[PDB]
Amino acid sequence: GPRESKLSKQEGQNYGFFLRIEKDTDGHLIRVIEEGSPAEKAGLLDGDRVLRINGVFVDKEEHAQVVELVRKSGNSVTLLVLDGDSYEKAVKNQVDLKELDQEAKL
Amino acid sequence: GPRESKLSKQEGQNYGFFLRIEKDTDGHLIRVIEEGSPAEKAGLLDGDRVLRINGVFVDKEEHAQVVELVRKSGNSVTLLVLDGDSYEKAVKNQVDLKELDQEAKL
């Protein structure tokens, strides 16, 4: 289910991913995670959607805002992410994404 | 990658950019971005290409209809632009410009 990913990096360093809007696709997508990066080390996966940034729900914010939020968070940031399939399955079944909290399968 | 620039102006004010048709040049070119202008504030960069206006794909529209789409948007307009370097690289690599949307590197 959702995961809380605690990213941390050095000054001048990128976290090492793209945030994207994709044509006819819901959500703020994480793509092209660089090998060995802060993003990788924190558990980010290709196709994850960003639900929250430092606990603030952003699924309905504009891309520019979501980017700004990451950027203004400085050299650490907490992302609540959901994998692409769980995210599409949640939106399919009209689940309230706001009410989703961390869940792990073991 | 592409950016959405959200330009806003006062009534009777100009945005502060030109659109041109240039010989042996692909696409709807943003030129002459006035310093201090709405265009500059929104993040337009010289050599930017206009891909979409209020979401509508225009790279293959006539210059006259693109200008008119901007004017008809009144005192704000949303432009999906792709910087001149990324755009020239995309046309070479035969990328479908219709499929490009906002992207940021973090």
Side-chain angles (χ1 to χ4, degrees), chain A residues 44-92:
Chain A
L44 296 192
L45 304 173
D46 194 86
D48 278 345
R49 273 66 160 179
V50 179
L51 298 186
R52 298 177 178 274
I53 295 167
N54 304 147
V56 174
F57 187 80
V58 298
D59 181 67
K60 300 298 203 183
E61 296 282 316
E62 294 288 318
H63 168 100
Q65 173 76 347
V66 180
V67 174
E68 180 178 297
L69 285 166
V70 175
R71 286 187 172 152
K72 290 193 141 300
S73 192
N75 298 145
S76 65
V77 70
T78 302
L79 305 174
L80 190 67
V81 299
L82 187 55
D83 73 270
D85 286 350
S86 296
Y87 184 94
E88 301 179 308
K89 203 189 287 309
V91 169
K92 287 253 180 184

Coordinates of all heavy atoms in Angstrom, one line a residue, chain A residues 44-92:
Chain A
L44 N 12.0 4.7 -3.5 CA 11.2 5.1 -4.6 C 11.3 4.2 -5.8 O 12.5 3.7 -6.2 CB 11.6 6.6 -5.1 CG 11.3 7.8 -4.1 CD1 11.4 9.0 -4.9 CD2 9.9 7.7 -3.4
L45 N 10.2 4.0 -6.5 CA 10.0 3.1 -7.6 C 9.4 3.8 -8.8 O 8.5 4.6 -8.7 CB 9.1 1.9 -7.3 CG 9.6 1.1 -6.2 CD1 8.5 0.0 -5.9 CD2 11.0 0.4 -6.5
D46 N 9.9 3.4 -10.0 CA 9.3 3.9 -11.3 C 7.9 3.7 -11.3 O 7.4 2.6 -11.1 CB 10.0 3.2 -12.5 CG 9.6 4.0 -13.8 OD1 10.3 4.9 -14.2 OD2 8.6 3.7 -14.3
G47 N 7.1 4.7 -11.6 CA 5.6 4.7 -11.7 C 4.9 5.0 -10.4 O 3.7 5.1 -10.4
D48 N 5.7 5.2 -9.3 CA 5.0 5.6 -8.0 C 4.4 7.0 -8.3 O 4.9 7.8 -9.1 CB 6.1 5.9 -7.0 CG 6.6 4.6 -6.2 OD1 5.9 3.5 -6.3 OD2 7.7 4.7 -5.6
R49 N 3.2 7.2 -7.6 CA 2.6 8.5 -7.6 C 2.9 9.1 -6.2 O 2.9 8.4 -5.1 CB 1.1 8.4 -7.8 CG 0.7 8.4 -9.2 CD 1.1 7.2 -10.0 NE 0.2 7.1 -11.2 CZ 0.4 6.2 -12.1 NH1 1.4 5.3 -12.1 NH2 -0.5 6.1 -13.2
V50 N 3.1 10.4 -6.2 CA 3.3 11.2 -5.0 C 1.9 11.6 -4.5 O 1.1 12.4 -5.1 CB 4.1 12.4 -5.2 CG1 4.2 13.2 -3.9 CG2 5.5 12.0 -5.8
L51 N 1.6 11.1 -3.3 CA 0.3 11.4 -2.6 C 0.5 12.6 -1.6 O -0.3 13.5 -1.6 CB -0.2 10.3 -1.8 CG -0.7 9.1 -2.7 CD1 -1.4 8.1 -1.7 CD2 -1.6 9.4 -3.8
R52 N 1.6 12.7 -0.9 CA 1.9 13.7 0.1 C 3.3 14.1 0.1 O 4.2 13.3 -0.1 CB 1.5 13.2 1.6 CG 0.0 12.9 1.7 CD -0.3 12.4 3.2 NE -1.7 12.1 3.2 CZ -2.6 13.0 3.5 NH1 -2.2 14.2 3.9 NH2 -4.0 12.7 3.5
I53 N 3.5 15.3 0.5 CA 4.9 15.9 0.7 C 4.9 16.5 2.1 O 4.1 17.4 2.4 CB 5.2 17.0 -0.4 CG1 5.3 16.3 -1.8 CG2 6.6 17.7 -0.1 CD1 5.3 17.4 -2.9
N54 N 5.8 16.0 2.9 CA 5.8 16.5 4.3 C 4.4 16.5 5.0 O 4.0 17.4 5.7 CB 6.6 17.8 4.5 CG 8.0 17.7 3.9 OD1 8.5 18.7 3.3 ND2 8.6 16.6 4.1
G55 N 3.7 15.4 4.6 CA 2.3 15.2 5.1 C 1.2 15.9 4.5 O 0.0 15.6 4.8
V56 N 1.5 16.8 3.5 CA 0.4 17.6 2.8 C 0.0 16.9 1.6 O 0.9 16.4 0.8 CB 1.0 19.0 2.5 CG1 0.0 19.8 1.6 CG2 1.4 19.8 3.8
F57 N -1.3 16.7 1.4 CA -1.8 16.0 0.3 C -1.7 16.8 -1.0 O -2.2 18.0 -1.1 CB -3.2 15.6 0.6 CG -3.9 14.7 -0.5 CD1 -3.6 13.4 -0.4 CD2 -4.8 15.2 -1.4 CE1 -4.2 12.5 -1.3 CE2 -5.4 14.3 -2.3 CZ -5.1 13.0 -2.3
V58 N -1.1 16.2 -2.0 CA -0.8 17.0 -3.3 C -1.3 16.3 -4.5 O -1.0 16.7 -5.7 CB 0.7 17.2 -3.3 CG1 1.2 18.1 -2.2 CG2 1.5 16.0 -3.5
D59 N -2.1 15.2 -4.4 CA -2.5 14.5 -5.6 C -3.3 15.5 -6.6 O -3.2 15.3 -7.8 CB -3.4 13.3 -5.2 CG -3.8 12.5 -6.4 OD1 -3.0 11.9 -7.1 OD2 -5.1 12.6 -6.7
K60 N -4.0 16.5 -6.0 CA -4.8 17.4 -6.8 C -4.1 18.7 -7.0 O -4.7 19.6 -7.7 CB -6.2 17.6 -6.2 CG -7.0 16.3 -6.2 CD -7.1 15.7 -7.6 CE -8.3 14.8 -7.7 NZ -8.3 14.2 -9.1
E61 N -2.8 18.9 -6.6 CA -2.1 20.1 -6.9 C -1.5 20.1 -8.3 O -1.4 19.0 -8.9 CB -1.0 20.4 -5.9 CG -1.5 20.6 -4.5 CD -2.0 22.0 -4.2 OE1 -1.4 23.0 -4.7 OE2 -3.1 22.1 -3.6
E62 N -1.2 21.3 -8.8 CA -0.6 21.4 -10.1 C 0.8 20.9 -10.0 O 1.5 21.1 -9.0 CB -0.6 22.8 -10.6 CG -2.0 23.3 -10.8 CD -2.6 22.7 -12.1 OE1 -1.8 22.6 -13.1 OE2 -3.8 22.4 -12.0
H63 N 1.3 20.3 -11.1 CA 2.7 19.9 -11.1 C 3.8 20.9 -10.6 O 4.7 20.5 -9.9 CB 3.1 19.4 -12.6 CG 4.5 19.2 -12.9 ND1 5.2 18.0 -12.8 CD2 5.5 20.1 -13.3 CE1 6.4 18.2 -13.1 NE2 6.6 19.5 -13.4
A64 N 3.7 22.2 -11.1 CA 4.6 23.2 -10.7 C 4.6 23.4 -9.1 O 5.7 23.5 -8.6 CB 4.3 24.6 -11.3
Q65 N 3.5 23.3 -8.5 CA 3.4 23.4 -7.0 C 4.1 22.2 -6.4 O 4.9 22.5 -5.4 CB 2.0 23.5 -6.5 CG 1.8 23.4 -5.0 CD 2.2 24.7 -4.2 OE1 2.8 25.6 -4.8 NE2 1.9 24.8 -2.9
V66 N 3.8 21.0 -6.8 CA 4.4 19.8 -6.3 C 6.0 19.8 -6.4 O 6.7 19.6 -5.4 CB 3.8 18.5 -7.0 CG1 4.5 17.2 -6.5 CG2 2.3 18.5 -6.7
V67 N 6.5 20.2 -7.6 CA 7.9 20.5 -7.7 C 8.4 21.5 -6.7 O 9.5 21.3 -6.1 CB 8.2 20.9 -9.2 CG1 9.6 21.3 -9.3 CG2 7.9 19.8 -10.2
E68 N 7.8 22.6 -6.6 CA 8.1 23.7 -5.7 C 8.2 23.2 -4.3 O 9.1 23.5 -3.5 CB 7.2 24.9 -5.8 CG 7.5 26.0 -4.9 CD 6.5 27.2 -5.0 OE1 6.5 27.8 -6.1 OE2 5.8 27.5 -4.1
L69 N 7.2 22.4 -3.9 CA 7.2 21.8 -2.5 C 8.4 21.0 -2.3 O 9.0 21.1 -1.2 CB 5.9 21.1 -2.2 CG 4.7 21.9 -2.0 CD1 3.3 21.1 -2.0 CD2 4.7 22.9 -0.7
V70 N 8.7 20.1 -3.2 CA 9.9 19.3 -3.1 C 11.2 20.2 -2.9 O 12.0 19.9 -2.0 CB 10.1 18.3 -4.2 CG1 11.4 17.5 -4.0 CG2 8.9 17.3 -4.2
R71 N 11.3 21.1 -3.7 CA 12.4 22.0 -3.8 C 12.6 22.8 -2.5 O 13.7 23.0 -2.0 CB 12.4 22.9 -5.1 CG 12.7 22.0 -6.4 CD 12.9 22.8 -7.6 NE 13.4 21.9 -8.6 CZ 13.1 22.1 -9.9 NH1 12.4 23.1 -10.4 NH2 13.6 21.2 -10.8
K72 N 11.5 23.4 -2.1 CA 11.5 24.3 -0.9 C 11.7 23.4 0.4 O 12.0 24.0 1.5 CB 10.3 25.2 -0.7 CG 10.3 26.2 -1.8 CD 9.3 27.3 -1.6 CE 9.9 28.7 -2.0 NZ 11.2 29.0 -1.2
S73 N 11.6 22.1 0.3 CA 11.8 21.2 1.5 C 13.3 21.1 1.7 O 13.7 20.7 2.8 CB 11.2 19.8 1.3 OG 11.2 19.1 2.5
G74 N 14.1 21.5 0.8 CA 15.6 21.6 1.0 C 16.2 20.2 0.8 O 15.9 19.5 -0.1
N75 N 17.1 19.8 1.7 CA 17.9 18.6 1.5 C 17.4 17.4 2.2 O 18.0 16.3 2.2 CB 19.3 18.8 1.9 CG 20.0 19.9 1.1 OD1 20.9 20.6 1.6 ND2 19.7 19.9 -0.1
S76 N 16.1 17.5 2.7 CA 15.4 16.3 3.1 C 13.9 16.6 2.8 O 13.5 17.8 2.8 CB 15.6 15.9 4.5 OG 15.1 16.9 5.4
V77 N 13.2 15.5 2.5 CA 11.8 15.6 2.2 C 11.2 14.2 2.5 O 11.8 13.2 2.2 CB 11.5 16.0 0.8 CG1 12.0 14.9 -0.2 CG2 10.0 16.4 0.6
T78 N 9.9 14.2 3.0 CA 9.2 13.0 3.2 C 8.0 12.9 2.2 O 7.2 13.7 2.1 CB 8.6 12.9 4.6 OG1 9.7 13.0 5.6 CG2 7.9 11.5 4.8
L79 N 8.1 11.8 1.4 CA 7.0 11.5 0.4 C 6.2 10.3 0.9 O 6.8 9.2 1.1 CB 7.6 11.3 -0.9 CG 8.5 12.3 -1.5 CD1 9.2 11.8 -2.8 CD2 7.8 13.7 -1.7
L80 N 4.9 10.5 0.8 CA 4.0 9.4 0.9 C 3.7 9.0 -0.6 O 3.1 9.8 -1.4 CB 2.6 9.7 1.6 CG 1.8 8.4 1.8 CD1 2.4 7.4 2.8 CD2 0.3 8.8 2.3
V81 N 4.1 7.8 -1.0 CA 4.0 7.3 -2.4 C 3.1 6.1 -2.5 O 2.9 5.4 -1.6 CB 5.3 7.2 -3.1 CG1 6.0 8.5 -3.1 CG2 6.2 6.1 -2.3
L82 N 2.5 5.9 -3.6 CA 1.8 4.7 -3.9 C 2.2 4.1 -5.2 O 2.2 4.8 -6.2 CB 0.3 5.0 -3.9 CG -0.6 3.8 -4.0 CD1 -0.3 2.9 -2.8 CD2 -2.0 4.3 -3.9
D83 N 2.5 2.8 -5.3 CA 2.9 2.2 -6.6 C 1.9 2.3 -7.7 O 0.7 2.5 -7.4 CB 3.3 0.7 -6.3 CG 2.1 -0.1 -6.1 OD1 1.8 -0.3 -4.9 OD2 1.6 -0.6 -7.1
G84 N 2.3 2.4 -8.9 CA 1.4 2.7 -10.1 C 0.2 1.9 -10.1 O -0.9 2.3 -10.2
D85 N 0.4 0.5 -10.0 CA -0.8 -0.4 -10.1 C -1.8 -0.2 -8.9 O -3.0 -0.1 -9.1 CB -0.3 -1.8 -10.1 CG 0.3 -2.1 -11.5 OD1 0.1 -1.4 -12.5 OD2 0.9 -3.2 -11.6
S86 N -1.3 -0.1 -7.7 CA -2.2 0.2 -6.5 C -2.8 1.5 -6.7 O -4.0 1.7 -6.3 CB -1.4 0.3 -5.2 OG -0.9 -1.0 -4.9
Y87 N -2.1 2.5 -7.1 CA -2.7 3.8 -7.5 C -3.8 3.8 -8.6 O -4.9 4.3 -8.4 CB -1.6 4.9 -7.9 CG -2.1 6.3 -8.1 CD1 -2.2 7.2 -7.1 CD2 -2.6 6.6 -9.4 CE1 -2.7 8.5 -7.4 CE2 -3.2 7.8 -9.6 CZ -3.2 8.8 -8.6 OH -3.7 10.0 -8.9
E88 N -3.5 3.1 -9.7 CA -4.5 3.0 -10.7 C -5.7 2.2 -10.2 O -6.9 2.6 -10.4 CB -4.0 2.4 -12.0 CG -2.8 3.2 -12.7 CD -2.3 2.6 -14.0 OE1 -2.0 1.4 -14.0 OE2 -2.2 3.3 -15.0
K89 N -5.5 1.1 -9.5 CA -6.5 0.2 -8.8 C -7.4 1.0 -7.8 O -8.6 0.8 -7.7 CB -5.9 -1.0 -8.1 CG -6.9 -2.2 -7.9 CD -6.4 -3.3 -7.0 CE -5.3 -4.2 -7.7 NZ -5.7 -4.7 -9.1
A90 N -6.7 1.9 -7.0 CA -7.4 2.8 -6.1 C -8.3 3.8 -6.8 O -9.4 4.1 -6.3 CB -6.5 3.5 -5.1
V91 N -7.8 4.4 -7.9 CA -8.6 5.4 -8.6 C -9.8 4.8 -9.4 O -10.8 5.3 -9.5 CB -7.7 6.2 -9.6 CG1 -8.6 7.0 -10.6 CG2 -6.7 7.1 -8.9
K92 N -9.5 3.6 -10.0 CA -10.5 2.7 -10.6 C -11.7 2.4 -9.6 O -12.8 2.6 -10.0 CB -9.9 1.3 -10.9 CG -8.9 1.2 -12.0 CD -9.5 0.5 -13.2 CE -8.5 0.4 -14.3 NZ -9.2 -0.2 -15.5

